[PDB]
Symmetry: D2
Subunit: 313 residues, 4 copies
């Protein structure tokens, strides 16, 4: 219980957690060299944790053997330099139990657990689901009703918070929901890049589980550590708007290809933003400055035929 | 003529998947449920739909259950595999295996949780539309993404697009049927009006799991607002928690499925099970599946399984 | 009485083809090519098929592929041929699961090998078979050259007490065949070059055959029309060619040369070399092309026609 | 340079334990029991562990169990012992995926058997091994008693051209061991009852051991402190008892009797009978309980203490 306590507190103290993009080879297999370069770039620019195969990491498109491999690989290669949080959540309790116990057995520092999506359940069912995995180790509960189509209500979060393994909540409902939890001492990470500044400084959020940190990790570190900076927050808004004009991770996948740090390979059902938006992206990089974005290569527009779409991989 | 056989079906049951106490499929109980559907005029079955808890299956057990259903019943009923996924890879592999097992058609949802652009949604459906007769499934209450009319009209030009399982409501159903697209209502409490007022071919039904004879009557024997009003309390009871919590609880009370739930589903509470006994008596037990007297059951009768 | 006839339906089969699983260029199943192979077997008097046996590369399938191929075969051909799923495993857990799923697909029977690589005690071997023998008609497969463990007579005799034990696919030789057939146990020879003598001199019911993949008509003649030392001697050069490397290397090469399977190998199998493919053209000319499956002129094929897949 | 160092780090190991995988009463892995077994090996001078080898029942594992156990062993013990994953398979697809996943998760080496049951040609064996050898330090496993196919010297000589081929786990005997060691190829004996003479008289580097599961200190002494024919002779009755039925039946029974694993077997393995367990208690007394793993007095155990799992 003393080790469990320290383990949970080591997650609660994290302010910058990157929902890391999973890059691919031309045949659709994981590009582990590109992935390792992405994680090293996050560490060098002050990311304190990584979600492995989150929504941004396309965990939804992995086989369990790929997903478990990427968790174990990240622990083995980077576990001493960053906290590794496996997205071992599922709409199936059986899948969540097996994936979470395997992830913890291979040394991941915490688990991200969404409520069941598509196959939505009752409040009693939601509690039953979370109770099967909460005992296994430090857990972040993920409320994203725009994707799950089911709000995790405060009554569920308050009951789960009775368990010392509940590290906190990745909250997407907004700053009023954030404040309801943080005023009661529950740790909250904003899941909304365009709200995380106000969440952090005005509503008691500990930090952010970020998509945008994939592109500008240094600026997101600054936003979470160095106090209110409404000017920097305003300067990042056009980039955050561009990143979410189509569902995540279409934007981050397109951007990382343009910056030359991931191959222009998409696993279906994702397809890149079209030419006009890629031209907009080069303009956004020029306005902020290329030096703030990951990678060293000059940003490219890329041609339509540079992109590879993989269904069977 | 494969696709035209699907297009003529008016009663398609989203069949419940029953379990043994260790959480494995109860294939004996499953066969008994499908046989009862065939005897009471069900014309098709969705295997591992939302009601069938496909979302809780391994692909191993989902494709097995499709193959089992084709072997046992394929000559007596149209077998539509729910081979859809939020992952294009999973949808491709499940659909080609389902068609290889001999299923008559596929049900395909738009990607849920990992939602995509219109262009990505089109790309997803195109990987599976060429494999055989396909019903497109629109349920924005569960996917949190409406398949817009623009997409359905474009998909409907593909001769393998049988039609739409539509859950938006009767205005959406009518927008499609008036433009010659075949529509099954996905909403039991709307399907009567859908069928008789809005050009729906029929229903892909949860309630037919409980009262298959009454649902066939509702789709075939003409407009009957009195029979429809008679079923509304039962339909309201079945959807007070998300499907399939209601049907799982009801089939346990009727004795045709064991009171075994795969998590994250748990039964309706005692007060609702007491109300179910009253709903059965009001409609008449003879109209519900099974021969056993309806039991309330104790909370401690229900087995909740996470590890199966 | 209901189960008795299902097992008796298997016991009466004389020609069971261990059917080859053909592939498309990236290593996925070629179901069109497979269906054509099975139809050819039926048309030429094969009475059963083993789905994903040693010849069918069941050892290279995932269980989802293997159970799909069984269900596909039952649905498409189950009324025209007896479908025996190779649902055996060196893991009891895998054998139980695969056998249950196979019978749920409607397969007529199961083929069960003793545990290979992870060999066990006589008591362990009996425990293994007892978990699956109750599920339906079962053929017990003894192939000590592959398993490195003989299923001894004492085990076959104990298994024989269960009515679901249809018989034995025996590879030890015609002396072991006779030890069983003289006690009323049904035996299929698993050795194409012994099956004639097994059938006519040692009371074997018939063969579970590799060679029937190429010349199903001639293997049917061999098992049905009586003693024919001339026909048996005529087939021996083809049988020697098919088993010069471990099965199914020969049959995979031959079916590609005859144009009824694509020249796609799942590793760790690779084709016979050009010298053997030239010999095969000569063997076909000597027997006559009309006796071999397919209508295309037999080809040698270039080394570069053969696609070797690891990531299947 | 890092690859040369990683390979040399495997080549220097003299005592590698083929660690037993212990189970909970329902058949799932007992990770608490496993962690205690690995700790005991480290404390008594084991330098490497095979995860899910023949002894570890890799043959009865699902891949998710097998990969988890490799990743768990690296995470908990990888700084204190070399972790060699048994990521081999008779299927090249299984071997490729398991091996790349095991190396991605930080295993130090891979153990690769030639394809068993589905045996292939020499050319096929080479093609199989070439798909995995480039992925990291590799021990080639020759056990013709289980595979029913000798990996011939020409295959080992060819693989030894690759800087990732660490060496050979050889079971054919001391003549084959010497054909490799005389050329500077690293060999571990796979035969506990030969490994003493193999180490001191035939140039073997050490042993990949079953017996080290029971007496790790005595096996370390045998591999490091020079010829000791007396100690080797003192161990022979124990080694004879451990292999009277196929491994791991003996080690599974012994570890239950020493109280360091539950008396739980995955089929098709079943324990040695009562008379053999009585013989074990006598063997432990003659050698001395202090040399065997665990602190608890050795127990005979009753027949009904043992649990046999089919659906694990
Ligand atoms: N596509 C499925 C399976 C993903 C499994 C690996 N995370 C889902 O989103 O639930
Ligand atoms: N739970 C996953 C996998 C189900 C796969 C079998 N239908 C999902 O809902 O996407
Ligand atoms: N390669 C494994 C798995 C095959 C499973 C499908 N038959 C074996 O030969 O046991
Ligand atoms: N029982 C199969 C599969 C084992 C997979 C895990 N090592 C075999 O021995 O090949
Ligand atoms: Na995430
Ligand atoms: Na459905
Ligand atoms: Na066979
Ligand atoms: Na080993």
């Amino acid at each position: 219980e003393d080790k469990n306590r320290t383990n949970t507190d080591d997650i609660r103290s994290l302010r910058v957690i990157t929902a890391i993009k999973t890059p691919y080879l031309p045949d659709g297999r994981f590009d582990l060299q590109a992935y390792d370069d992405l994680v090293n770039t996050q560490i060098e620019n002050g990311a304190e944790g990584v979600i492995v195969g989150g929504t941004t990491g396309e965990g939804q498109l992995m086989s369990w053997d790929e997903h478990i491999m990427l968790i174990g690989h990240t622990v083995n290669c980077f576990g001493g330099r960053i906290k590794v949080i496996g997205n071992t959540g599922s709409n199936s309790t059986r899948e969540a139990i097996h994936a979470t116990e395997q992830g913890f057995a291979m040394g991941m520092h915490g688990a991200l657990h969404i409520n069941p999506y598509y196959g939505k359940t009752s409040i009693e069912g939601m509690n039953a689901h979370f109770q099967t995995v909460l005992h296994m180790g430090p857990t972040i509960i993920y409320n994203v009703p725009g994707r799950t189509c089911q709000d995790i209500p405060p009554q569920v979060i308050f009951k789960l918070s009775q368990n010392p393994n509940m590290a906190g909540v990745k909250e997407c409902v907004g700053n009023n929901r954030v404040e309801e939890y943080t005023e009661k001492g529950i740790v909250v990470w904003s899941g909304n890049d365009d709200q995380c500044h106000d969440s952090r400084w005005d509503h008691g959020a500990t930090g952010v589980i970020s998509v945008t940190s994939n592109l500008v990790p240094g600026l997101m570190r600054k936003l979470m550590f160095e106090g209110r900076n409404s000017a920097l927050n305003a300067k990042l808004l056009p980039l955050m708007d561009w990143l979410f004009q189509e569902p995540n991770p279409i934007g981050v996948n397109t951007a990382l290809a343009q910056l030359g740090v991931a191959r222009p390979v998409f696993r279906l059902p994702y397809v890149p933003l079209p030419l006009s938006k890629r031209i907009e992206f080069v303009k956004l990089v020029k306005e902020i400055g290329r030096e703030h974005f990951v990678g060293d290569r000059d940003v490219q527009v890329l041609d339509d035929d540079d992109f590879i779409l993989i269904g069977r991989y």
